[PDB]
């Protein structure tokens, strides 16, 4: 059924502001709405129009924490709202057509080259006022664009005004003789009442000629715009299962139609119970049926926009068209899809969104098991990373990105709104506002506060289960497996699984040892943390439970087609220019919703080899490639919630396929971009290492920077070529922060064979370059004491940095090393480069201590 | 008898709103179960669930003044918009659809939560001080205030994001004036006191309310245009009336001074009447369960008046009566979805019955008096929860009671009393329904229950051999606890004109008997020809088989039992059969000297002043009498002093000094008299 979920939004996680990187008030003379603009340039500003009327955000949606962002301060507030607000280009300039209130008509031009790069250069007017026609007296609601030759204006009192423009700028009237002064008194009219109007409240075109208007009673009435005169009118109070003995009229000016292809759609209140879908075809309008929704919460979803589109990747590849029917109330939000798939709109394929977070759904089925988060001392990186700095500095001094404000303590106004915002996770930045469709058929919900959105994505088939699991059916039989593997690890407490997890981590570490079979391992977990953890019931029950299920099969499916990637690769990626927020979020959160769901489905299936003595080596395959993966998972679970600022840019990082930032258009695009990365992760189950490539660079970046969470990305076996090489970037770690007597040990610990032939990758970072360690220090240094040695010309570069960044002992008692464990010491000049600087350098470090011998027979 | 009856232990919940236990009301609604018990801090609200502590977990304090000004269990809600079930899914999303709400005692200042769990963001409500009793929700997203003044000032919130408008519903100074019926609780909770009924029973959309008296009004209230919509005001107290007296009789100066008071409502489908004359100090009741058939909300004759046969005899602290069933839909069938009837003051469980008028029975699991008391229970508000009994039980957590005369005496007692007392333990809800089967007053009620229960440690264990032999030591415990019940339940000294203590003494002469079925030397083949006179046998090599024939019953037997004694015969003058004797003598001549220090233990004035009364009446072989049977211990004294003339003066003293042990309780019918100075 239901495959697309949220993954909410705040790109301030990626940084440490709590607010927008810049912000211009530029002056004419915010929360309640967001629509983006169709531009041909691909990257789409995002107009944020505010509820206060007068101030609009306009800043790139993708390179939206570096551009340019612009607050237009209108001199006064716009006619009613968003709908006198009408964009798109027209000449290479971004032209805002607004009624202003008081009187007059307002166009702005706003360039594509001082929105979309740093500063400003747009100069002199750009804002002209001009009055076509008295709208002083006459008062519309909603203005039109239908060309760029006519943005027709709505009135309330008169009837329907053509306002064609002449040059793009001032216009003329060009008066409709449709109705709306020979209507809106009739016989379920009213003019004496904000109510009940033959005038909009939301007009679509069908096919530049014929354009039909929704009136506040729901009439779709039907004009032809080269004579002026009816064509058809109908009234959806007889065209629908609704009467007018218990319609809700509409009382507002909202939005109800929404188009794509043929399918005119009108949603009717009647308690909010019954959506309608309707066609038009070239008029004679269509009725077929209603559909009950899916909906929760009373009831009192109120729709802010409603668009559909053509077919899309989910779990089905196929439908007629989605109806994005986007939904709020307060706090919460949720796009439920009403995924017609055919004319007939009583068949269907309901999507529910969770209308909470990506982690608000793991401590709803818990998977903070591995949670490795900070306090309030350590809480200034890691609550201002689980938050984003924004929720986390504030408290009640949020009053308007949320829309909850407060009054007094005799109201219910001050305690609510102090409740609400540290309740605020990600979600309640996210009020869901309107849909555009960037690229082609991105399903973008942008939400009322910049900065935000509601990020839909392929969220995969196998990205809903274990926080979908009742609701799908979704998957195969491998879908039922994991369900009935429930039935033993959801009615346990999952600490237990902890630690039983705990025991994995320690088969790979080598504390319960790899040379012998992993029913040998299984039976001595048995043993420790299985131990009347088991119900005996929960016992019995799984057992038939698996063998209910062909076993090596529905494991053959999981771990070779899910849990493994096979190679994924760039498909046309076209980038964005510049790390920033909003490229970040779809290379860390979308990834670790396929990650940790993993790690809870290796949890799940290694508890099923504990209870049995049937081979674990029929599943040698697939149980050594889940123990192979865990240790891998393990690490990005320590650390996606202590960095939301990290560790984005590593995995960005790793190719230059994924650049910094990644504008992908489709979902051939995206399957492929988080299977990249899932394979970046899972190195296969090793295709190379990650903790070499992704670390040891980062550890010379950022752990100079002063992250000490890479004592929870150290974690290796060291066994295999770990034992040299994570050896000597385990000992930069503490390097890199100036904890020295780990340095001095872990550095000397192992031997080097390695000599100038590389298999350290290591950038020192410079701050400019990257002065290249393991190589082109190598054959420097190690070079001029004069051939490789396999001890001390190492121990001279110890010794040499240390004093550098200062630690005298430590270094002092390296070059006591290197001095007496000289390899060759026949005292001859070419050999006395490694037996004179390294004894030079040796008594440099003496003089400041002031010694006693040292200086004995060494003078 | 424990019928379908569930009753063990849930859970006990996450604590820092349930640091507060003390018993008081629950705020309950039929959606999945929400529990209360009420804190001086903030009203913790909690969801109920067996991943006990916190993972999937609901407990959200709501507001509540720390002042003088306080909050009352009922009085904090979960307010939906459109009574009608939705409010899970927003257990971690937390959606506008469970909100709630506060208008103060004597302040009457709304803190009116906007959500769930955003509470920072309060509007404040007026009808102004003392307007007040408890909230509820309704529909508009509104709340109920409810005045005790039978008033319900409807509060209208504007749904969009909360936030309530003060205006004067319904009712304003209608029911003010009236002070000739009373529309003040002395049961409260928003089921008791109120009830708006989201689908349970006809209810669904409907705020109901019922007075003290049966003052009984509907409201709907239509959340599009916001308004209260009168749909009855009738009173149900004349509906009842008249069949409350046909059934319990009131004598003149007895209705003079009557009261009924109609205690609750179950969504209007239910009124717990109390007819009560104030002059004796049992609240009785009558169920007088009304369904409608046909049209709703008006009278009916399917109001109908269940007669009960328990009794409540009142305690005037730790009172609230209250019921809470969760399938309360029925007037027809079912027993496997809990809808049996619950009564509470706050210490029991009263598993009671309903819809017994409103079809041909339904079978429904036992009536009468019913406790609990298994161990420290006190309740602080029952409900349900996902549509099964919940017990908020006050020391023990959550505990689960969930639900899914003549005859009883004479042959059901060896079923049913069987049942009652083979357990009583793991559920103690058989012992009041079957115990006051026997315990209430009929003259073969409790002359021959006392015999014929007696013969129910003879039916112990359903096995008549296992329990014969080495579970015979098991049996004999079990003779002695089922004689505790017996003794604090009132069956004893009710008698007929054969002695009621054949019981006691049979247990006396019990200890021969397990002597010899444990310890087996060769005094285990003494019960041969015992048994193999009185009734004709499988005829084999146990005569240990058939013994629950030979249980409970010293009359001729122990005559028959020396039979074999007697049988050891052929020439024993030089000694060697002697060895026999000896062994005879070590275990069953203690047994005897006992009655002694088994009759001093027991039985002192029990067995004077019944045994000698019993004593007058003889015929010679039936037993009063015999007390150990006159002619043949005196045969058995013979035997062991012919014995001594028979072997040494070392077996001999052994045999000897055991003859001289046991010549008192061929005397101890009148020297019980020891320790006082007395066909």
Redesign the interface.
Known sequence: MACLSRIDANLLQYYEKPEPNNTVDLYVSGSEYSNCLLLSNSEYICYHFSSRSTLLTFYPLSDAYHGKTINIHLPNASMNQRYTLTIQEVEQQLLVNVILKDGSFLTLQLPLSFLFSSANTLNGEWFHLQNPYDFTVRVPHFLFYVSPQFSVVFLEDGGLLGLKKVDGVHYEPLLFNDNSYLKSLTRFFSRSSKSDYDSVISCKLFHERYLIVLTQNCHLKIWDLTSFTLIQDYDMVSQSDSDPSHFRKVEAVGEYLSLYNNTLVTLLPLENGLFQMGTLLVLTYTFQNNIPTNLSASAIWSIVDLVLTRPLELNVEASYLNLIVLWKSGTASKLQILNVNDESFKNYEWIESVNKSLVDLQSEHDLDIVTKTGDVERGFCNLKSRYGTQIFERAQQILSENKIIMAHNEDEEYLANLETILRDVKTAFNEASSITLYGDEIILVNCFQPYNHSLYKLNTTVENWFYNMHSETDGSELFKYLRTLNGFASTLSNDVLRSISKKFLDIITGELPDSMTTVEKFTDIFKNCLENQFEITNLKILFDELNSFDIPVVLNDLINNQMKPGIFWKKDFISAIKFDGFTSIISLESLHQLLSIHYRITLQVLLTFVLFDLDTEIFGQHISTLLDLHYKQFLLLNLYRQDKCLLAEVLLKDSSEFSFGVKFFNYGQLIAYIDSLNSNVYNITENSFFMTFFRSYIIENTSHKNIRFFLENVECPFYLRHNEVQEFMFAMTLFSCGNFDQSYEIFQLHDYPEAINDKLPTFLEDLKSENYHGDSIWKDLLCTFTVPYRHSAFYYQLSLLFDRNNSQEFALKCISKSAEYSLKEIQIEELQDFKEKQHIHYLNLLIHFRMFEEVLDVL | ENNRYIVKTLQTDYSSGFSNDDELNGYIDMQIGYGLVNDHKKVYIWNIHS?QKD??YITVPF?SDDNDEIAVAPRCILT???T?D?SP?????????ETG?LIIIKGS???????I????????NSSGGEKCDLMLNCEP?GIVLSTNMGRIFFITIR????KPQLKLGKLLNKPFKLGIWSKIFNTNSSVVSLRNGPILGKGTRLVYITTNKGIFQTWQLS??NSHPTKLIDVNIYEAILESLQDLYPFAHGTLKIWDSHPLQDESSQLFLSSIYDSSCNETYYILSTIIFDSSSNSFTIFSTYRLNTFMESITDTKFKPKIFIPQMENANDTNEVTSILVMFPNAVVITQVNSKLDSSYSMRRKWEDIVSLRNDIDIIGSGYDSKSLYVLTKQMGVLQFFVKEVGFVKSHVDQAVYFSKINANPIDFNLPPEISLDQESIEHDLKLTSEEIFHSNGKYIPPMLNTLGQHLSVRKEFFQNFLTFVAKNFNYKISPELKLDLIEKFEILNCCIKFNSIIRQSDVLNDIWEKTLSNYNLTQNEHLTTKTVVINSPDVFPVIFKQFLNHVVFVLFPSQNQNFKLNVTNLINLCFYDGILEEGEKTIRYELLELDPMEVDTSKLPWFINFDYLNCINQCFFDFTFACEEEGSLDSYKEGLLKIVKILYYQFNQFKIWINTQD
């Open positions: 991943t993972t999937p507001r939906f918009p459109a009608m939705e899914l927003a257990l971690n999303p937390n959606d506008q659809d709400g200042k709304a803190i009116y939560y906007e959500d769990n955003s509470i920072n963001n309060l509007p404040i997203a749904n969009s994001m909360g959340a599009t």
